[PDB]
A paper describes a structure:
Unlike most other constructed circularly permutated proteins, CP90 had significantly enhanced binding affinity and improved selectivity toward long-chain carbohydrates (i.e., its affinity for β-cyclodextrin is less than that for amylose EX-I, which is less than that for soluble and insoluble starches). The asymmetric unit of CP90 reveals a homodimer in which each unit is arranged in a slightly tilted antiparallel fashion. The RoCBM21 and the CP90 share a similar overall topology. CP90 crystal structure showed only 7 β-sheets while RoCBM21 has 8 β-sheets. The major interface contacts involve hydrophobic and hydrogen bond interactions, which were mapped onto the CP90 structure using Pymol. The super-positioning of RoCBM21 and CP90 showed that substantial shift in the orientation of amino acids either at site I or site II had not occurred. However, two of the aromatic residues (Tyr93 and Tyr94) and one hydrophilic residue (Asn101), which form part of binding pocket in the RoCBM21 have been moved to the N-terminal unstructured region in CP90 (see the unstructured region in Figure 1). The dominant negative charge near the binding site II is caused by the replacement of positively charged Lys91 in RoCBM21 to the N-terminal unstructured region of CP90 and the additional negative charge provided by the C-terminal carboxyl, which is proximal to the site II of CP90. Although CP90 can adopt the second binding path (hydrophilic binding path), the dimerisation provides an alternate binding path to connect the binding site I and II. The proposed alternate binding path for CP90 involves the hydrophilic residues Lys54, Lys55, Glu107 near the binding site residue Tyr52 in one subunit that connect to the next subunit through hydrophilic core Lys97, Asp62, Asp65, Asp68, Asn69, Asn70 and Asn72 situated near second binding site residue Trp67.
Numbering used by the authors:
A (entry chain A), B (entry chain B): 2 to 109
């Protein structure tokens, strides 16, 4: 029954909003990702060019095999970026190994 | 008010631990799922029969098209089920429509 803290050396962590750098033209563009050895997760700018959207991450595993482009992670809508025509989509999945990827965006 | 509550008619919600009904033999078995018209999510029993695991949900969309078994959602490891040889994996994705699915479990 002990309590410990991380209060950034008694300063607290100071937050300002991370502003979007919305792509100049691309219909879909990776914002950021992290692979920590167990989880592959990230954030993706998605242009609101149609109501129905499907966004997926296609990847090559730990030995750089794409498995006929069959290693797939689905992204989820996170929310619109206010004042822009882009939205944030996020993804996160347990992944044993990953060497490369690209993003696929399907509109109807 | 500016603050509202749901306190179950002043009784509070009473939580009993939901005990696992581990499959009697299956290597992978759906526990539960929910589709609410926007999000398709759920929970899956996965037998710990090898260290390396990949668990995916393959589904047919809103007009019952499988797209050659190409509509894929990746599940993530949630935790072991204490005292059993099964684990919980979960999944959740934004999905426009879905009519059917099955689960695929790859060990290595
Ligand atoms: Cl610190
Ligand atoms: Cl990220
Ligand atoms: Cl639109
Ligand atoms: Cl995850
Ligand atoms: Cl109460
Ligand atoms: Cl009561
Ligand atoms: Cl569920
Ligand atoms: Cl659909
Ligand atoms: Cl069918
Ligand atoms: Cl185990
Ligand atoms: N996914
Ligand atoms: N409260
Ligand atoms: N309530
Ligand atoms: N309450
Ligand atoms: Na501290
Ligand atoms: Na300070
Ligand atoms: Na402070
Ligand atoms: Na990044
Ligand atoms: Na791998
Ligand atoms: Na592809
Ligand atoms: Na079964
Ligand atoms: Na269910
Ligand atoms: Na799989
Ligand atoms: Na448990
Ligand atoms: Na998922
Ligand atoms: Na069927």
């Amino acid at each position: 029954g002990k309590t410990y803290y991380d209060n950034n050396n008694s300063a607290n962590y100071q937050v300002s909003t991370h502003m979007a750098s919305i792509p100049s033209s691309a219909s879909v563009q990776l914002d950021s990702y992290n692979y920590d050895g167990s989880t592959f997760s990230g954030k993706i700018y998605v242009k609101n060019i149609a109501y129905s959207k499907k966004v997926t991450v296609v990847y090559a595993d730990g030995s750089d095999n794409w498995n006929n482009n069959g290693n797939i992670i689905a992204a989820s809508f996170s929310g619109p970026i206010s004042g822009s025509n882009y939205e944030y989509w996020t993804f996160s999945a347990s992944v044993k190994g990953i060497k490369e990827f690209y993003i696929k965006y399907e509109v109807s």
